[PDB]
Amino acid sequence: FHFDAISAFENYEIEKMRDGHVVVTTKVVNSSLNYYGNAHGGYLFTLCDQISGLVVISLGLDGVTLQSSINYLKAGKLDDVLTIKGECVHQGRTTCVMDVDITNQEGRNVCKATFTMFVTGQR
Amino acid sequence: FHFDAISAFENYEIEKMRDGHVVVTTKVVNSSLNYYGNAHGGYLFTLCDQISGLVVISLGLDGVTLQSSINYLKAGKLDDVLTIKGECVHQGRTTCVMDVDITNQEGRNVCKATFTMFVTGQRS
Amino acid sequence: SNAMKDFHFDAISAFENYEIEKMRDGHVVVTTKVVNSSLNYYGNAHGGYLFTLCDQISGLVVISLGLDGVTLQSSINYLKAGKLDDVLTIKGECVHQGRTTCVMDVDITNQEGRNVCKATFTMFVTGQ
Amino acid sequence: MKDFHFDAISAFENYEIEKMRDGHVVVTTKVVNSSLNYYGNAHGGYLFTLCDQISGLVVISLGLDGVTLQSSINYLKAGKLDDVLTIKGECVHQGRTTCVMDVDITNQEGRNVCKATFTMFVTGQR
Ligand SMILES: CC(C)(COP(=O)(O)OP(=O)(O)OC[C@H]1O[C@@H](n2cnc3c(N)ncnc32)[C@H](O)[C@@H]1OP(=O)(O)O)[C@@H](O)C(=O)NCCC(=O)NCCS
Ligand SMILES: CC(C)(COP(=O)(O)OP(=O)(O)OC[C@H]1O[C@@H](n2cnc3c(N)ncnc32)[C@H](O)[C@@H]1OP(=O)(O)O)[C@@H](O)C(=O)NCCC(=O)NCCS
Numbered sequence: 001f002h003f004d005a006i007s008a009f010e011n012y013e014i015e016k017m018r019d020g021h022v023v024v025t026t027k028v029v030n031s032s033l034n035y036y037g038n039a040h041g042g043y044l045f046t047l048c049d050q051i052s053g054l055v056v057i058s059l060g061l062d063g064v065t066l067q068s069s070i071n072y073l074k075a076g077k078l079d080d081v082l083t084i085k086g087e088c089v090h091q092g093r094t095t096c097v098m099d100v101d102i103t104n105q106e107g108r109n110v111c112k113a114t115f116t117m118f119v120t121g122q123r
Numbered sequence: 124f125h126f127d128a129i130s131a132f133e134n135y136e137i138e139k140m141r142d143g144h145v146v147v148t149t150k151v152v153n154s155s156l157n158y159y160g161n162a163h164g165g166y167l168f169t170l171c172d173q174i175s176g177l178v179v180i181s182l183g184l185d186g187v188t189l190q191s192s193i194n195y196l197k198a199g200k201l202d203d204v205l206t207i208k209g210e211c212v213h214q215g216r217t218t219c220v221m222d223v224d225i226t227n228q229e230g231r232n233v234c235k236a237t238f239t240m241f242v243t244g245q246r247s
Numbered sequence: 248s249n250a251m252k253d254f255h256f257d258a259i260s261a262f263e264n265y266e267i268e269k270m271r272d273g274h275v276v277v278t279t280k281v282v283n284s285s286l287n288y289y290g291n292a293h294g295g296y297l298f299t300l301c302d303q304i305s306g307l308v309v310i311s312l313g314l315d316g317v318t319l320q321s322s323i324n325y326l327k328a329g330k331l332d333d334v335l336t337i338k339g340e341c342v343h344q345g346r347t348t349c350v351m352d353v354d355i356t357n358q359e360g361r362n363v364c365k366a367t368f369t370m371f372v373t374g375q
Numbered sequence: 376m377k378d379f380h381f382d383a384i385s386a387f388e389n390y391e392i393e394k395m396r397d398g399h400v401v402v403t404t405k406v407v408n409s410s411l412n413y414y415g416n417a418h419g420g421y422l423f424t425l426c427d428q429i430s431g432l433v434v435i436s437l438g439l440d441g442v443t444l445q446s447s448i449n450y451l452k453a454g455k456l457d458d459v460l461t462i463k464g465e466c467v468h469q470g471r472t473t474c475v476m477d478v479d480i481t482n483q484e485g486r487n488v489c490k491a492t493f494t495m496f497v498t499g500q501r
Contacts, residue, residue, distance in 0.1 A: 001140065006131040006169055007154075014124060034176070041188035042172040046129055046165025053157070053164075054124075065164035066473065067445050067494050069192045069322040071350045071369060073343045090326045090362050094472065094496070095444065097324050097365065112342060112350065114367060116324060116445050116494065118473075189348065190320050190369045192447035194475050194492060196468035213451040213487050217347070218319060218371070220449050220490070232467050235475065237449055237492065239320050239369065241348075256413040261420060284385070288378035294443045295386060295424030302419045318419055322447045 007031035008046035014054075020088035022054045028080045039076025044111050048100040051086035052115040055098050059088060062121040066095065070113040074104070081105040094119055130154035131169035137177075143211035145177045151203040162199025167234050171223040174209040175238040178221050182211060185244040186219065193236040197227070204228040217242050251310050254303075261299045267307075273341030275307045281333040292329025292363075301353040301366040304339040308351050312341060315374035316349060323366040327357070334358040347372055379432055386424050392432070398466030400432045406458040417454025422480060422489050425462050430476040430493040433464040440499040441474060448491040452482070459483040472497055 010031055016023035026047065034040040049065055056063040076082065086100040098115040133154055139146035149170065157163040172188055179186040199205060206226050213220040221238040248255065248267075258265060262279055269276035279300065287293035301323060309316050329335060336356050343350040351368040383390055387404060394401035402425075410421045427443060434441045454460060461481050468475040474495040480488040 001137060003132070003173070005133050006173070007128055008130075008165060009126065009128045017124060036185070036187075038187075040169070040172070041176075041191070042131060042165065042169025045168045045172065045191070046131075046163070049163070049165040049168065050126070050129070057124075062159075064159075064161070064198070065195050067192070067194050068164070068168070069190070069367060069447060071190050071343070071367065072188050073345070073350065075187070089365065090324075092326075097326065109343060112367075114322065114324065114365070192320075192322060192492060194468070194494060196470075196475055212490060213449075215451075220451060222490070235467055235477065235492065237447060237490065239449065253413040257418070260409070260412075260418065288381040293382065293386075293424075294427045294446070295420060298423045298427070298446070299418070299420030302423070318450055320447070320449050321419070321423075322445070324445050325443055 003035050006040045006043055008043050009050065017054055017058045020055055020059050022051050022058060022086040024051050024084045026082050028076055028078050028082065033078060041072060044076060044102060045070055047082065047084050047102060048113040051084045051100050052098040052117060055086045055088050056096065056117050057123065059091065060123050061119050062123055063096065063117045063119045065115060066118040067116040068113060070111060072111045073109045076110050082110060126158055129163045129166050131166050132173065140177055140181050143178055143182050145174050145181055145209040147174050147207045149205050151199050151201055151205060156201065164195060167195065167199060167225060168193055170205065170207050170225060171236040172238065174207045174223055175221040175240060178209045178211050179219060179240055180246065183246050184242050185246055186240040186242045188238060189218065189241040190239040191236060193234060195234045196232045199233055205233060254306060254310065258303060261303050270307060270311050273308055273312050273344065275304050275311060275339040277304050277307065277337045279335050281329050281331055281335060283331065286331060290331065294325060297329060297355060297364050298323055300337050300355060304337045304353050305351045305368040308339040308341050309349065309370065312344060313375055314372055316370040316372045318368055319371050320369040321366060323364060325364050326362040329363050335363060376435065379435060382428055386428065395432060395436050398433055398437050398469065400429055400436055400464040402429050402462045404460050406454050406456055406460060408456065411456060415456065419450065422454060423448050425480060426478040426491040427493065429462045429464040429478055430495065433466050433476045434474060434495055437466060437469060438501060439474065439497055440501040441495040441497045443493055444496040445494040446491060448489060450489050451487045454488055460488060
């Protein structure tokens with residue numbers, strides 16, 4: 001039983017990365033898709049996780065993902081332009097909590113995630 | 124600020140895939156890694172999500188990921204061989220719930236996830 | 248709110264006190280005061296109490312949308328301890344209303360405006 | 376174990392610790408009327424609290440002090456009056472700063488009732 005490799009961030013644009021606020025855009029391509037021809041769940045999550053890490057960095061911190069929860073609201077499609085917005089909603093000494101949401105070019109919600117990040121040091 | 128693309132399943136072996144139980148192994152490679160040289164969180168999640176889909180298919184169903192929660196317990200390292208075990212723990216009328224575990228070659232727990240899948244149909 | 252007497256039944260299991268400040272179209276605001284029965288052995292609002300607050304308000308969001316539904320999954324982050332006599336504001340909002348699923352965000356903040364806890368509920372819609 | 380028993384009797388009308396050894400805990404309880412919602416099903420908060428407290432017990436059995444940082448729960452099948460629930464907690468990761476517990480609740484017919492994961496922040500030894 002064969003299935004294709006899943007790649008994330010073969011293209012992206014960082015529109016914003018400042019003080020706990022991150023906006024990144026990307027276009028869904030063939031390497032983003034699952035066997036059903038929709039944006040893979042792992043692809044969408046990876047978008048959110050990377051943007052969460054980007055938020056961490058924008059706070060001048062180094063950290064690792066400790067825990068995450070994600071809801072998939074609307075399918076992502078080939079050639080969709082996805083906007084990934086990440087923001088810190090709580091900054092603690094050892095943990096941070098980030099909200100990350102993805103919307104498509106028509107402004108429709110694709111997925112929504114919450115990340116608990118473990119602070120591992122200071123940039 | 125530049126960062127590399129993250130790839131998943133550039134290599135894998137399906138050891139088991141039958142009746143709601145799936146076992147897949149894979150090797151952590153350079154495309155698996157984040158900027159710190161550890162297995163990317165999205166990579167690990169993708170391993171879990173894909174094996175969850177594999178569980179759905181092994182039950183003779185087609186489905187979509189509705190919700191997922193994941194805990195990252197121990198870092199995945201370059202050249203680690205990861206074993207991904209997924210099993211259905213509840214089959215509802217339109218939804219299924221999968222437990223997925225990733226352990227390394229040393230038998231240490233790497234991460235643990237729960238997936239709520241939406242059943243979209245019945246396979247042929 | 249005789250129209251939601253079921254809530255008022257379950258609420259007297261989860262609140263020794265509460266006030267609904269807002270309840271309209273997927274947006275709910277409820278306040279409550281932390282009491283002794285809310286506390287664990289160490290004097291903090293125990294996780295089950297806070298979770299139950301969020302769950303109850305999530306049910307309220309569902310009702311405010313005119314729906315019947317069942318919780319499939321829930322996630323909660325604990326940010327700051329709740330203390331005796333704290334006044335907690337529990338805000339619920341629908342972030343996705345589908346015909347088959349709903350997703351609710353519930354946030355709890357204290358009288359000082361600090362984040363107490365943050366939760367998400369994944370619900371299966373069962374009716375009107 | 377004064378803290379666990381205060382919290383357990385303050386939240387539950389009955390419980391039994393059947394097993395408690397080194398990150399593995401088993402507790403049973405019988406669903407009573409106070410456990411039920413207006414429609415006669417076990418409250419989501421009741422089930423969650425069962426899981427959270429058993430998670431705290433797992434922490435204790437490891438000889439640690441900690442606080443719940445994050446939790447996820449999946450509701451699989453409704454709990455009913457007179458059901459006997461078996462709540463099993465297992466540590467799947469004991470870290471220096473965090474612990475992760477897997478908690479499963481099954482009923483007397485062996486059916487999965489709910490499944491939860493708890494992320495605990497370790498605050499000390501105990
Ligand atoms: C799971 C899901 C179908 C639930 O549907 P919902 O809560 O009712 O939301 P909506 O009412 O807005 O419906 C959205 C789409 O799903 C369809 N749909 C809704 N309920 C459905 C159901 N019970 N059965 C089959 N299709 C359904 C709708 O017809 C609609 O189709 P459209 O794209 O042509 O408009 C929806 O949330 C979803 O598609 N999430 C994205 C899943 C995903 O991308 N996972 C990652 C890849 S596996
Ligand atoms: C999140 C995490 C660091 C929590 O730490 P923990 O519960 O104490 O677990 P451990 O005791 O086994 O420690 C693991 C590492 O984290 C370090 N660490 C633990 N607590 C720390 C703390 N308060 N501050 C800084 N570092 C800490 C440890 O020193 C150790 O580092 P090392 O392997 O280089 O020696 C750990 O669970 C983990 O590494 N999870 C996987 C993270 C991941 O892979 N995310 C996806 C990629 S971003």
